[PDB]
Every structure is written in structure tokens, then in C-alpha cells.
Amino acid sequence: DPLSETKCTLKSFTVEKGIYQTSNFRVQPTESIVRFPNITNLCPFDEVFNATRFASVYAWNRKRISNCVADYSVLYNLAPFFTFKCYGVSPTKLND
Amino acid sequence: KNKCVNFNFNGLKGTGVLTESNKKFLPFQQFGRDIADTTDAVRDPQTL
Amino acid sequence: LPVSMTKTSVDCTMYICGDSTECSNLLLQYGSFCTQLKRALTGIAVEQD
Amino acid sequence: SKFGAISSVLNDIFSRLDPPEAEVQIDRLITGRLQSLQTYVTQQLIRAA
Ligand SMILES: *[C@@H]1O[C@H](CO)[C@@H](O)[C@H](O)[C@H]1NC(C)=O
């Protein structure tokens, strides 16, 4: 009850006459809403990793990936792709 | 709308109430910002 | 001659963490800063009156 | 202000990084904001005097 909160703040079992500031009444949220773009097509990651031939390092290849939903578990679950170190973002959060 | 919910817009997480706004965004803009650079208004996906 | 100035109050956790709950969980590890700030601001506020 | 962190928004720090370094970034932001708030309180005390 409000009186016990005052004792707990004052660290005393007796409270003198007066007005005491105790806490804040922040209103808790009720629902949960998520909004994402309404595309459904998968991202073309297969031809980038399963490509038969890669380019030379000096003439490195570059592919533009956009307007698609990208799931990184298809990359994640394959064992042979060992060295997966990411900069500026955790590898686990890439799916979010 | 008009209720205390915790939202998620394109990975922009936060808690608050969402109301109709009359901030005339330009087509290239996506969301606004307040004095302290926290997001004030946002353009929701798949509804614009 | 000025006599009194504006009485102000600061919500420590709201300012320092916003709506992030785990931020408040981390903030609890820093001791009793918010208590001292609240006490000092309350002292100034009563001093104005 | 970033205070040397990757962003000034707590939610981005939490949703982008693994907690072991997210806590370092949050520590940076928390200590910077707490220092600024301390500075505010001290100047308020001097003005009150
Ligand atoms: C997603 O659905 C909304 C609701 O009808 C629609 O306005 C929008 O155009 C859709 N997006 C796509 C990419 O089809």
C-alpha cells in the first residue's frame, strides 16, 4: 500500500508528518504490434554461394539483393561454411 | 491505435501510443525525429 | 531583486533509460545515484518556497 | 550523443548486438548520461545558492 512504500523509501518503520515522493506510475503496455513490408519472395542467396565459379580477387564480383525476404538460417545450418564472423551486428540477430 | 502498445517497425522497437498525424512527409522520407533524435513519427510499411 | 527560481524535478530512470527495461536492470547496478539526485532537487524545491 | 557507442538509441543497441558487447555499449551510454545529469544537478545547486 502507499504507506508501506513510504517506509521502504525512508528505510524507517516510523514516518514523520509531511509529503514524500515515492515512485512513478508509468502505464504498462498491453498489446504487441509488429509491422513489416508486404513482400514474400525469397532472396536469391543460392546462386551467390552455390555458384560454380567465383571471380578473381582483383575483379571481385558484386551482387545486389533487395525487394526480397532474407532468411539467414539457410546459410547458418550448412556446416561447411565455417568462418562466419560478423562486424557491427551479432550473427544471431540477422534474422530480425 | 490510441493504446499503449510496444511496437516494431522494420526493426525499430519501442513503446508508446500510435495516432494519426498531420506531418506532411516527403515521398523519400521514412520517419521523423524530435529534438533529442528519438523517433517521433514513422511511416508504417504496407500501408504508407 | 530575484527571490525564487523554477522548482524542477527529474525522473532519473526515464531520462537515462527511456522505455528499455533491461536498461533499468543494468542501471540498478550503479548504486544510489538517482536517490541522491532526487534528494538534492527536493532540497532546492523546498528552499525556493 | 553517442558517447563513443555505435548508436544513441538503446533499442537499436539491444536489437543489433549480442549481450556480451551490448552491455559494454549500454554501459558507455549510461555513464555518459549519468555524468550529464550530475553536471546539471551541480549547476542547479550553485544557482540555488
Ligand atoms: C500489402 O498489403 C497492403 C494491404 O492491402 C497493401 O496496401 C500493400 O500494397 C501490400 N503490399 C504489397 C507489396 O503487395
PDB file of C-alpha atoms and ligand atoms in Angstrom:
ATOM      1  CA  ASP A   1       0.000   0.000   0.000  1.00  0.00           C
ATOM      2  CA  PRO A   2       1.191   3.606  -0.389  1.00  0.00           C
ATOM      3  CA  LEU A   3       2.170   3.893   3.282  1.00  0.00           C
ATOM      4  CA  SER A   4       4.469   0.866   3.127  1.00  0.00           C
ATOM      5  CA  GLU A   5       6.156   2.292   0.032  1.00  0.00           C
ATOM      6  CA  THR A   6       6.957   5.428   2.035  1.00  0.00           C
ATOM      7  CA  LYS A   7       8.517   3.388   4.844  1.00  0.00           C
ATOM      8  CA  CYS A   8      10.503   1.370   2.311  1.00  0.00           C
ATOM      9  CA  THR A   9      11.818   4.552   0.668  1.00  0.00           C
ATOM     10  CA  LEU A  10      12.672   6.206   4.001  1.00  0.00           C
ATOM     11  CA  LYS A  11      14.204   2.969   5.376  1.00  0.00           C
ATOM     12  CA  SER A  12      12.284   3.508   8.612  1.00  0.00           C
ATOM     13  CA  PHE A  13       9.310   1.937  10.365  1.00  0.00           C
ATOM     14  CA  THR A  14       8.026   5.341  11.540  1.00  0.00           C
ATOM     15  CA  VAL A  15       7.177   8.151   9.120  1.00  0.00           C
ATOM     16  CA  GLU A  16       7.026  11.762  10.266  1.00  0.00           C
ATOM     17  CA  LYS A  17       4.263  14.103   9.159  1.00  0.00           C
ATOM     18  CA  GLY A  18       4.787  15.533   5.698  1.00  0.00           C
ATOM     19  CA  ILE A  19       4.641  14.797   1.988  1.00  0.00           C
ATOM     20  CA  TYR A  20       7.048  12.268   0.494  1.00  0.00           C
ATOM     21  CA  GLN A  21       7.862  11.455  -3.121  1.00  0.00           C
ATOM     22  CA  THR A  22       7.953   7.690  -3.604  1.00  0.00           C
ATOM     23  CA  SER A  23       7.881   6.477  -7.219  1.00  0.00           C
ATOM     24  CA  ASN A  24       6.313   6.908 -10.660  1.00  0.00           C
ATOM     25  CA  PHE A  25       3.123   5.391 -12.073  1.00  0.00           C
ATOM     26  CA  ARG A  26       4.314   4.564 -15.618  1.00  0.00           C
ATOM     27  CA  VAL A  27       1.433   2.967 -17.526  1.00  0.00           C
ATOM     28  CA  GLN A  28       2.291  -0.550 -18.650  1.00  0.00           C
ATOM     29  CA  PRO A  29       1.711  -1.660 -22.256  1.00  0.00           C
ATOM     30  CA  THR A  30      -0.989  -4.199 -23.043  1.00  0.00           C
ATOM     31  CA  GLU A  31      -0.782  -5.452 -26.638  1.00  0.00           C
ATOM     32  CA  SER A  32       2.081  -6.041 -29.073  1.00  0.00           C
ATOM     33  CA  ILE A  33       2.258  -4.938 -32.705  1.00  0.00           C
ATOM     34  CA  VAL A  34       4.793  -5.667 -35.446  1.00  0.00           C
ATOM     35  CA  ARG A  35       4.697  -4.117 -38.921  1.00  0.00           C
ATOM     36  CA  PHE A  36       6.909  -5.293 -41.783  1.00  0.00           C
ATOM     37  CA  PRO A  37       6.896  -4.797 -45.565  1.00  0.00           C
ATOM     38  CA  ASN A  38       4.442  -6.893 -47.554  1.00  0.00           C
ATOM     39  CA  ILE A  39       6.872  -8.735 -49.833  1.00  0.00           C
ATOM     40  CA  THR A  40       7.007 -12.528 -49.877  1.00  0.00           C
ATOM     41  CA  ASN A  41       9.616 -13.529 -52.464  1.00  0.00           C
ATOM     42  CA  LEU A  42      12.741 -15.212 -51.125  1.00  0.00           C
ATOM     43  CA  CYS A  43      16.157 -13.625 -51.526  1.00  0.00           C
ATOM     44  CA  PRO A  44      18.465 -15.116 -54.184  1.00  0.00           C
ATOM     45  CA  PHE A  45      21.230 -16.418 -51.922  1.00  0.00           C
ATOM     46  CA  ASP A  46      21.683 -19.805 -53.617  1.00  0.00           C
ATOM     47  CA  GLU A  47      23.380 -18.602 -56.800  1.00  0.00           C
ATOM     48  CA  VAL A  48      25.748 -16.449 -54.729  1.00  0.00           C
ATOM     49  CA  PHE A  49      27.072 -19.272 -52.528  1.00  0.00           C
ATOM     50  CA  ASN A  50      26.368 -22.324 -54.717  1.00  0.00           C
ATOM     51  CA  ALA A  51      27.902 -20.643 -57.774  1.00  0.00           C
ATOM     52  CA  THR A  52      30.081 -22.985 -59.813  1.00  0.00           C
ATOM     53  CA  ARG A  53      32.816 -20.380 -60.363  1.00  0.00           C
ATOM     54  CA  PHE A  54      33.768 -17.291 -58.370  1.00  0.00           C
ATOM     55  CA  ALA A  55      35.602 -14.301 -59.799  1.00  0.00           C
ATOM     56  CA  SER A  56      39.210 -13.302 -59.233  1.00  0.00           C
ATOM     57  CA  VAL A  57      40.018 -11.222 -56.167  1.00  0.00           C
ATOM     58  CA  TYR A  58      41.118  -8.147 -58.131  1.00  0.00           C
ATOM     59  CA  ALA A  59      37.910  -8.262 -60.202  1.00  0.00           C
ATOM     60  CA  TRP A  60      35.690  -9.195 -57.274  1.00  0.00           C
ATOM     61  CA  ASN A  61      32.027  -9.805 -58.043  1.00  0.00           C
ATOM     62  CA  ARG A  62      29.190  -7.773 -56.531  1.00  0.00           C
ATOM     63  CA  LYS A  63      25.512  -8.753 -56.423  1.00  0.00           C
ATOM     64  CA  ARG A  64      22.578  -6.543 -55.424  1.00  0.00           C
ATOM     65  CA  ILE A  65      19.995  -8.205 -53.170  1.00  0.00           C
ATOM     66  CA  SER A  66      16.776  -6.313 -52.496  1.00  0.00           C
ATOM     67  CA  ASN A  67      12.974  -6.442 -52.597  1.00  0.00           C
ATOM     68  CA  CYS A  68      13.008  -9.907 -51.059  1.00  0.00           C
ATOM     69  CA  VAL A  69      12.706 -11.632 -47.695  1.00  0.00           C
ATOM     70  CA  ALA A  70      16.074 -12.921 -46.482  1.00  0.00           C
ATOM     71  CA  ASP A  71      16.312 -15.808 -44.019  1.00  0.00           C
ATOM     72  CA  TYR A  72      19.858 -16.395 -42.798  1.00  0.00           C
ATOM     73  CA  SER A  73      19.218 -19.840 -41.301  1.00  0.00           C
ATOM     74  CA  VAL A  74      19.615 -21.437 -44.745  1.00  0.00           C
ATOM     75  CA  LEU A  75      23.139 -20.027 -44.662  1.00  0.00           C
ATOM     76  CA  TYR A  76      23.518 -20.814 -40.958  1.00  0.00           C
ATOM     77  CA  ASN A  77      22.566 -24.506 -40.869  1.00  0.00           C
ATOM     78  CA  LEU A  78      25.086 -25.641 -43.504  1.00  0.00           C
ATOM     79  CA  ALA A  79      28.133 -26.941 -41.635  1.00  0.00           C
ATOM     80  CA  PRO A  80      30.910 -26.491 -44.257  1.00  0.00           C
ATOM     81  CA  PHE A  81      30.682 -22.668 -44.119  1.00  0.00           C
ATOM     82  CA  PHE A  82      32.842 -22.498 -41.017  1.00  0.00           C
ATOM     83  CA  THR A  83      34.316 -18.991 -40.677  1.00  0.00           C
ATOM     84  CA  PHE A  84      31.271 -16.797 -40.021  1.00  0.00           C
ATOM     85  CA  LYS A  85      32.369 -13.680 -38.132  1.00  0.00           C
ATOM     86  CA  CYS A  86      30.246 -10.545 -38.395  1.00  0.00           C
ATOM     87  CA  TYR A  87      31.078  -6.902 -37.708  1.00  0.00           C
ATOM     88  CA  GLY A  88      28.695  -4.359 -36.205  1.00  0.00           C
ATOM     89  CA  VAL A  89      25.863  -6.864 -35.670  1.00  0.00           C
ATOM     90  CA  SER A  90      25.553 -10.199 -33.896  1.00  0.00           C
ATOM     91  CA  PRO A  91      25.104 -13.234 -36.188  1.00  0.00           C
ATOM     92  CA  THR A  92      22.065 -14.360 -34.188  1.00  0.00           C
ATOM     93  CA  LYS A  93      20.135 -11.118 -34.743  1.00  0.00           C
ATOM     94  CA  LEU A  94      20.481 -11.117 -38.548  1.00  0.00           C
ATOM     95  CA  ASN A  95      17.104 -12.846 -38.874  1.00  0.00           C
ATOM     96  CA  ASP A  96      15.347  -9.994 -37.042  1.00  0.00           C
TER      97      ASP A  96
ATOM     98  CA  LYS B   1      -4.094   2.868 -32.327  1.00  0.00           C
ATOM     99  CA  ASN B   2      -4.637   5.107 -29.294  1.00  0.00           C
ATOM    100  CA  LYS B   3      -3.450   2.384 -26.895  1.00  0.00           C
ATOM    101  CA  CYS B   4      -0.203   1.829 -25.006  1.00  0.00           C
ATOM    102  CA  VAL B   5       1.483  -0.897 -27.069  1.00  0.00           C
ATOM    103  CA  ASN B   6       5.086  -1.887 -27.737  1.00  0.00           C
ATOM    104  CA  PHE B   7       5.623  -1.729 -31.479  1.00  0.00           C
ATOM    105  CA  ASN B   8       8.193  -2.912 -34.019  1.00  0.00           C
ATOM    106  CA  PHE B   9       8.525  -1.091 -37.355  1.00  0.00           C
ATOM    107  CA  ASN B  10      11.211  -2.572 -39.621  1.00  0.00           C
ATOM    108  CA  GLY B  11      13.236  -3.463 -36.545  1.00  0.00           C
ATOM    109  CA  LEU B  12      12.569  -0.121 -34.822  1.00  0.00           C
ATOM    110  CA  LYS B  13      11.426  -1.286 -31.388  1.00  0.00           C
ATOM    111  CA  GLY B  14       9.709   0.969 -28.870  1.00  0.00           C
ATOM    112  CA  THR B  15       6.708   1.516 -26.626  1.00  0.00           C
ATOM    113  CA  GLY B  16       4.014   4.159 -26.899  1.00  0.00           C
ATOM    114  CA  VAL B  17       0.715   5.097 -28.486  1.00  0.00           C
ATOM    115  CA  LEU B  18       0.225   5.406 -32.248  1.00  0.00           C
ATOM    116  CA  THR B  19      -2.066   8.169 -33.510  1.00  0.00           C
ATOM    117  CA  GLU B  20      -2.875   9.744 -36.852  1.00  0.00           C
ATOM    118  CA  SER B  21      -0.513  12.623 -37.580  1.00  0.00           C
ATOM    119  CA  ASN B  22      -0.598  15.581 -39.965  1.00  0.00           C
ATOM    120  CA  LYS B  23       3.154  15.828 -40.587  1.00  0.00           C
ATOM    121  CA  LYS B  24       3.404  16.286 -44.355  1.00  0.00           C
ATOM    122  CA  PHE B  25       6.186  13.829 -45.104  1.00  0.00           C
ATOM    123  CA  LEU B  26       8.009  13.998 -48.400  1.00  0.00           C
ATOM    124  CA  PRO B  27       7.931  10.819 -50.513  1.00  0.00           C
ATOM    125  CA  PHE B  28      11.580   9.952 -49.854  1.00  0.00           C
ATOM    126  CA  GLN B  29      11.241  10.383 -46.083  1.00  0.00           C
ATOM    127  CA  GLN B  30      10.556   7.372 -43.865  1.00  0.00           C
ATOM    128  CA  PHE B  31      10.316   8.705 -40.295  1.00  0.00           C
ATOM    129  CA  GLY B  32      10.691  11.930 -38.347  1.00  0.00           C
ATOM    130  CA  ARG B  33      12.791  12.819 -35.319  1.00  0.00           C
ATOM    131  CA  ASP B  34      12.468  15.057 -32.271  1.00  0.00           C
ATOM    132  CA  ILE B  35      15.000  17.378 -30.606  1.00  0.00           C
ATOM    133  CA  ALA B  36      16.897  14.549 -28.907  1.00  0.00           C
ATOM    134  CA  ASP B  37      16.989  12.442 -32.127  1.00  0.00           C
ATOM    135  CA  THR B  38      14.499   9.835 -30.908  1.00  0.00           C
ATOM    136  CA  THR B  39      11.897   8.781 -33.459  1.00  0.00           C
ATOM    137  CA  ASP B  40       8.802  10.973 -33.163  1.00  0.00           C
ATOM    138  CA  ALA B  41       6.715   9.911 -36.177  1.00  0.00           C
ATOM    139  CA  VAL B  42       7.037   6.940 -38.516  1.00  0.00           C
ATOM    140  CA  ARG B  43       5.610   5.810 -41.851  1.00  0.00           C
ATOM    141  CA  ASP B  44       4.333   2.287 -41.462  1.00  0.00           C
ATOM    142  CA  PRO B  45       5.110  -0.306 -44.154  1.00  0.00           C
ATOM    143  CA  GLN B  46       2.488  -1.906 -46.406  1.00  0.00           C
ATOM    144  CA  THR B  47       0.121   0.993 -45.701  1.00  0.00           C
ATOM    145  CA  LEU B  48       2.241   4.139 -46.314  1.00  0.00           C
TER     146      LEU B  48
ATOM    147  CA  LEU C   1      15.739  41.509  -6.842  1.00  0.00           C
ATOM    148  CA  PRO C   2      15.174  37.848  -7.752  1.00  0.00           C
ATOM    149  CA  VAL C   3      13.705  35.820  -4.908  1.00  0.00           C
ATOM    150  CA  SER C   4      12.903  32.325  -6.182  1.00  0.00           C
ATOM    151  CA  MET C   5      13.701  30.249  -9.250  1.00  0.00           C
ATOM    152  CA  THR C   6      11.851  27.460 -11.016  1.00  0.00           C
ATOM    153  CA  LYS C   7      11.334  24.279  -8.994  1.00  0.00           C
ATOM    154  CA  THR C   8      12.274  21.349 -11.225  1.00  0.00           C
ATOM    155  CA  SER C   9      12.045  17.571 -10.935  1.00  0.00           C
ATOM    156  CA  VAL C  10      13.900  14.926 -12.933  1.00  0.00           C
ATOM    157  CA  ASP C  11      12.859  11.322 -13.490  1.00  0.00           C
ATOM    158  CA  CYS C  12      16.221   9.568 -13.317  1.00  0.00           C
ATOM    159  CA  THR C  13      15.328   6.235 -14.912  1.00  0.00           C
ATOM    160  CA  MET C  14      13.023   7.701 -17.570  1.00  0.00           C
ATOM    161  CA  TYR C  15      15.706  10.136 -18.714  1.00  0.00           C
ATOM    162  CA  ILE C  16      18.601   7.692 -18.539  1.00  0.00           C
ATOM    163  CA  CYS C  17      16.955   4.553 -19.976  1.00  0.00           C
ATOM    164  CA  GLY C  18      13.758   5.569 -21.764  1.00  0.00           C
ATOM    165  CA  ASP C  19      11.416   2.610 -22.182  1.00  0.00           C
ATOM    166  CA  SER C  20      14.110  -0.093 -22.181  1.00  0.00           C
ATOM    167  CA  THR C  21      13.533  -2.410 -19.222  1.00  0.00           C
ATOM    168  CA  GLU C  22      16.876  -4.215 -19.409  1.00  0.00           C
ATOM    169  CA  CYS C  23      18.492  -0.778 -19.339  1.00  0.00           C
ATOM    170  CA  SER C  24      16.836  -0.224 -15.961  1.00  0.00           C
ATOM    171  CA  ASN C  25      18.040  -3.663 -14.874  1.00  0.00           C
ATOM    172  CA  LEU C  26      21.590  -2.611 -15.753  1.00  0.00           C
ATOM    173  CA  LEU C  27      21.057   0.790 -14.108  1.00  0.00           C
ATOM    174  CA  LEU C  28      20.211  -0.862 -10.791  1.00  0.00           C
ATOM    175  CA  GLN C  29      23.863  -1.974 -10.696  1.00  0.00           C
ATOM    176  CA  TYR C  30      25.156   1.612 -10.423  1.00  0.00           C
ATOM    177  CA  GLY C  31      24.114   2.236  -6.812  1.00  0.00           C
ATOM    178  CA  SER C  32      22.085   5.130  -5.393  1.00  0.00           C
ATOM    179  CA  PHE C  33      22.694   7.947  -7.874  1.00  0.00           C
ATOM    180  CA  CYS C  34      19.024   8.590  -8.627  1.00  0.00           C
ATOM    181  CA  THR C  35      18.262   8.787  -4.905  1.00  0.00           C
ATOM    182  CA  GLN C  36      20.893  11.487  -4.382  1.00  0.00           C
ATOM    183  CA  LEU C  37      19.660  13.482  -7.375  1.00  0.00           C
ATOM    184  CA  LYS C  38      16.064  13.291  -6.166  1.00  0.00           C
ATOM    185  CA  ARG C  39      17.125  14.372  -2.677  1.00  0.00           C
ATOM    186  CA  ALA C  40      19.132  17.343  -3.964  1.00  0.00           C
ATOM    187  CA  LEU C  41      16.356  18.528  -6.271  1.00  0.00           C
ATOM    188  CA  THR C  42      13.788  18.198  -3.475  1.00  0.00           C
ATOM    189  CA  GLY C  43      16.024  20.268  -1.212  1.00  0.00           C
ATOM    190  CA  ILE C  44      16.260  23.006  -3.831  1.00  0.00           C
ATOM    191  CA  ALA C  45      12.494  22.886  -4.368  1.00  0.00           C
ATOM    192  CA  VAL C  46      11.675  23.359  -0.686  1.00  0.00           C
ATOM    193  CA  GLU C  47      14.355  26.053  -0.418  1.00  0.00           C
ATOM    194  CA  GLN C  48      12.564  28.104  -3.083  1.00  0.00           C
ATOM    195  CA  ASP C  49       9.348  28.138  -1.048  1.00  0.00           C
TER     196      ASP C  49
ATOM    197  CA  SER D   1      25.032  11.934 -28.036  1.00  0.00           C
ATOM    198  CA  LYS D   2      26.678   8.610 -28.817  1.00  0.00           C
ATOM    199  CA  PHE D   3      29.391   8.910 -26.129  1.00  0.00           C
ATOM    200  CA  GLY D   4      31.554   6.635 -28.254  1.00  0.00           C
ATOM    201  CA  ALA D   5      28.866   3.992 -28.814  1.00  0.00           C
ATOM    202  CA  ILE D   6      27.613   2.735 -32.162  1.00  0.00           C
ATOM    203  CA  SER D   7      24.253   4.490 -31.719  1.00  0.00           C
ATOM    204  CA  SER D   8      22.403   6.777 -29.328  1.00  0.00           C
ATOM    205  CA  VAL D   9      19.218   4.653 -29.309  1.00  0.00           C
ATOM    206  CA  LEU D  10      19.049   1.896 -26.700  1.00  0.00           C
ATOM    207  CA  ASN D  11      16.618  -0.291 -28.647  1.00  0.00           C
ATOM    208  CA  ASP D  12      18.979  -0.436 -31.629  1.00  0.00           C
ATOM    209  CA  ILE D  13      21.904  -1.423 -29.399  1.00  0.00           C
ATOM    210  CA  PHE D  14      19.817  -4.187 -27.850  1.00  0.00           C
ATOM    211  CA  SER D  15      18.306  -5.478 -31.103  1.00  0.00           C
ATOM    212  CA  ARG D  16      21.578  -5.406 -33.062  1.00  0.00           C
ATOM    213  CA  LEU D  17      24.266  -6.772 -30.738  1.00  0.00           C
ATOM    214  CA  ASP D  18      24.970  -9.864 -28.669  1.00  0.00           C
ATOM    215  CA  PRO D  19      24.501  -9.028 -24.952  1.00  0.00           C
ATOM    216  CA  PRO D  20      28.206  -9.539 -24.066  1.00  0.00           C
ATOM    217  CA  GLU D  21      29.115  -6.378 -26.027  1.00  0.00           C
ATOM    218  CA  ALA D  22      25.677  -4.780 -25.935  1.00  0.00           C
ATOM    219  CA  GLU D  23      26.288  -4.398 -22.205  1.00  0.00           C
ATOM    220  CA  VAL D  24      29.544  -2.539 -22.917  1.00  0.00           C
ATOM    221  CA  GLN D  25      27.756  -0.149 -25.270  1.00  0.00           C
ATOM    222  CA  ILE D  26      24.917   0.351 -22.783  1.00  0.00           C
ATOM    223  CA  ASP D  27      27.469   0.997 -20.041  1.00  0.00           C
ATOM    224  CA  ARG D  28      29.003   3.740 -22.178  1.00  0.00           C
ATOM    225  CA  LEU D  29      25.640   5.408 -22.795  1.00  0.00           C
ATOM    226  CA  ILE D  30      24.512   5.047 -19.173  1.00  0.00           C
ATOM    227  CA  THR D  31      27.689   6.522 -17.721  1.00  0.00           C
ATOM    228  CA  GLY D  32      27.629   9.422 -20.187  1.00  0.00           C
ATOM    229  CA  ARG D  33      24.006  10.300 -19.471  1.00  0.00           C
ATOM    230  CA  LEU D  34      24.549   9.955 -15.724  1.00  0.00           C
ATOM    231  CA  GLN D  35      27.540  12.303 -15.926  1.00  0.00           C
ATOM    232  CA  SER D  36      25.489  14.891 -17.820  1.00  0.00           C
ATOM    233  CA  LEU D  37      22.690  14.660 -15.259  1.00  0.00           C
ATOM    234  CA  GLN D  38      25.202  15.086 -12.416  1.00  0.00           C
ATOM    235  CA  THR D  39      26.532  18.214 -14.118  1.00  0.00           C
ATOM    236  CA  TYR D  40      23.000  19.590 -14.354  1.00  0.00           C
ATOM    237  CA  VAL D  41      22.354  18.949 -10.659  1.00  0.00           C
ATOM    238  CA  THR D  42      25.617  20.595  -9.585  1.00  0.00           C
ATOM    239  CA  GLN D  43      24.963  23.744 -11.600  1.00  0.00           C
ATOM    240  CA  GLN D  44      21.417  23.857 -10.223  1.00  0.00           C
ATOM    241  CA  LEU D  45      22.805  23.722  -6.683  1.00  0.00           C
ATOM    242  CA  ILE D  46      25.194  26.602  -7.381  1.00  0.00           C
ATOM    243  CA  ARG D  47      22.405  28.709  -8.888  1.00  0.00           C
ATOM    244  CA  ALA D  48      20.214  27.880  -5.892  1.00  0.00           C
ATOM    245  CA  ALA D  49      22.913  29.202  -3.567  1.00  0.00           C
TER     246      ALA D  49
HETATM  247  C1  LIG E   1       0.410  -5.398 -48.539  1.00  0.00           C
HETATM  248  O1  LIG E   1      -0.973  -5.299 -48.144  1.00  0.00           O
HETATM  249  C2  LIG E   1      -1.487  -3.961 -48.092  1.00  0.00           C
HETATM  250  C3  LIG E   1      -2.909  -4.061 -47.592  1.00  0.00           C
HETATM  251  O2  LIG E   1      -3.824  -4.255 -48.662  1.00  0.00           O
HETATM  252  C4  LIG E   1      -1.382  -3.313 -49.468  1.00  0.00           C
HETATM  253  O3  LIG E   1      -1.841  -1.968 -49.394  1.00  0.00           O
HETATM  254  C5  LIG E   1       0.063  -3.346 -49.944  1.00  0.00           C
HETATM  255  O4  LIG E   1       0.156  -2.813 -51.259  1.00  0.00           O
HETATM  256  C6  LIG E   1       0.595  -4.777 -49.931  1.00  0.00           C
HETATM  257  N1  LIG E   1       1.990  -4.800 -50.339  1.00  0.00           N
HETATM  258  C7  LIG E   1       2.428  -5.471 -51.408  1.00  0.00           C
HETATM  259  C8  LIG E   1       3.900  -5.382 -51.681  1.00  0.00           C
HETATM  260  O5  LIG E   1       1.673  -6.122 -52.122  1.00  0.00           O
END
